[PDB]
Amino acid sequence: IQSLTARAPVWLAAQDTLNQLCEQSGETLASSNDVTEYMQQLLEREREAT
Amino acid sequence: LERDALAERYATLSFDVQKIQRAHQAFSQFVGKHLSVAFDTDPEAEIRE
């Protein structure tokens, strides 16, 4: 419980900003690997834009 | 003869562009597959302990 408690708000915070970040992007992020995929997509889009 | 050197320099520049592009693409792919555990702790030492 202590461990979970120590990790309780952090997880929630992790979700919270994530949601905002998930909302900041048109695509909704659902998985860590999906997050990495979106990130590398963003890198490629940035490279093409530059 | 003059344009020979121009072509050589252009070839070097084109190869450099290609190398940079290849490195960028490798890094992009890497991060796509790699960020999840990048710079994370070594399990081996922990398991030995």
Short mmCIF file of C-alpha atoms in Angstrom, two decimals:
data_model
loop_
_atom_site.label_atom_id
_atom_site.label_comp_id
_atom_site.label_asym_id
_atom_site.label_seq_id
_atom_site.Cartn_x
_atom_site.Cartn_y
_atom_site.Cartn_z
CA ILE A 1 0.00 0.00 0.00
CA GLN A 2 2.76 2.41 0.94
CA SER A 3 4.51 1.70 -2.35
CA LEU A 4 1.26 2.08 -4.24
CA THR A 5 0.44 5.19 -2.25
CA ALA A 6 3.83 6.70 -3.02
CA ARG A 7 3.17 5.84 -6.65
CA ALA A 8 -0.53 6.79 -6.55
CA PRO A 9 -0.43 10.54 -7.35
CA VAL A 10 2.50 10.12 -9.73
CA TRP A 11 0.55 7.68 -11.85
CA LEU A 12 -2.42 10.02 -11.80
CA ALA A 13 -0.18 12.94 -12.72
CA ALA A 14 1.34 10.75 -15.43
CA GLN A 15 -2.15 10.25 -16.83
CA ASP A 16 -3.20 13.87 -16.39
CA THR A 17 -0.51 15.62 -18.40
CA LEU A 18 -0.48 12.66 -20.77
CA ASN A 19 -4.13 13.34 -21.51
CA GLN A 20 -3.32 17.00 -22.13
CA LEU A 21 -0.42 15.94 -24.33
CA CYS A 22 -2.64 13.31 -25.92
CA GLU A 23 -5.10 16.13 -26.55
CA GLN A 24 -2.35 18.45 -27.78
CA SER A 25 -1.89 15.99 -30.65
CA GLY A 26 -4.74 15.33 -33.05
CA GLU A 27 -4.00 11.62 -32.87
CA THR A 28 -4.85 9.96 -29.56
CA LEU A 29 -2.00 8.01 -27.97
CA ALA A 30 -2.84 4.64 -26.45
CA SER A 31 0.45 2.79 -25.88
CA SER A 32 4.08 3.47 -25.09
CA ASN A 33 5.16 1.91 -28.39
CA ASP A 34 2.40 3.89 -30.07
CA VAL A 35 3.84 6.93 -28.32
CA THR A 36 7.29 6.17 -29.75
CA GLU A 37 5.74 5.66 -33.18
CA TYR A 38 3.97 9.01 -33.02
CA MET A 39 7.20 10.60 -31.80
CA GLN A 40 9.27 9.26 -34.68
CA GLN A 41 6.47 10.29 -37.04
CA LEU A 42 6.75 13.77 -35.53
CA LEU A 43 10.51 13.65 -36.07
CA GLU A 44 10.03 12.73 -39.71
CA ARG A 45 7.39 15.43 -40.17
CA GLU A 46 9.76 17.92 -38.53
CA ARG A 47 12.60 16.83 -40.80
CA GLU A 48 10.41 17.16 -43.88
CA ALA A 49 9.08 20.54 -42.74
CA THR A 50 12.60 21.87 -42.23
CA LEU B 1 39.90 18.70 -66.39
CA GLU B 2 38.52 21.59 -64.34
CA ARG B 3 35.02 20.12 -64.12
CA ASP B 4 36.57 16.84 -62.98
CA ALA B 5 37.29 18.42 -59.60
CA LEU B 6 33.82 19.98 -59.52
CA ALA B 7 32.29 16.56 -60.10
CA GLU B 8 34.52 15.04 -57.42
CA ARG B 9 33.51 17.68 -54.89
CA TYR B 10 29.85 17.31 -55.84
CA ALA B 11 30.11 13.55 -55.41
CA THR B 12 31.62 14.03 -51.96
CA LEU B 13 28.82 16.43 -51.04
CA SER B 14 26.14 14.09 -52.37
CA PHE B 15 27.63 11.17 -50.47
CA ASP B 16 27.72 13.27 -47.32
CA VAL B 17 24.07 14.19 -47.83
CA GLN B 18 23.28 10.51 -48.26
CA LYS B 19 25.21 9.52 -45.14
CA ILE B 20 23.46 12.20 -43.09
CA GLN B 21 20.08 11.13 -44.43
CA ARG B 22 20.85 7.50 -43.62
CA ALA B 23 21.95 8.42 -40.11
CA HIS B 24 18.82 10.49 -39.60
CA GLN B 25 16.60 7.68 -40.81
CA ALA B 26 18.39 5.19 -38.58
CA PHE B 27 17.90 7.50 -35.61
CA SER B 28 14.23 8.03 -36.44
CA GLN B 29 13.64 4.29 -36.67
CA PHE B 30 15.70 3.75 -33.52
CA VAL B 31 13.66 6.21 -31.47
CA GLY B 32 10.50 4.68 -32.91
CA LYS B 33 11.52 1.29 -31.52
CA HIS B 34 13.93 2.36 -28.81
CA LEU B 35 12.83 5.25 -26.57
CA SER B 36 10.74 3.06 -24.27
CA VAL B 37 13.84 1.65 -22.54
CA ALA B 38 16.49 4.15 -23.63
CA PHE B 39 18.99 5.10 -20.91
CA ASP B 40 17.22 2.83 -18.43
CA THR B 41 19.07 0.93 -15.70
CA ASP B 42 20.98 -2.28 -16.27
CA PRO B 43 18.96 -5.34 -15.21
CA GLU B 44 22.05 -7.57 -15.24
CA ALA B 45 23.76 -5.99 -12.25
CA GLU B 46 20.46 -5.99 -10.38
CA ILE B 47 19.84 -9.65 -11.17
CA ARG B 48 23.36 -10.56 -10.08
CA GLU B 49 22.78 -8.71 -6.84
#
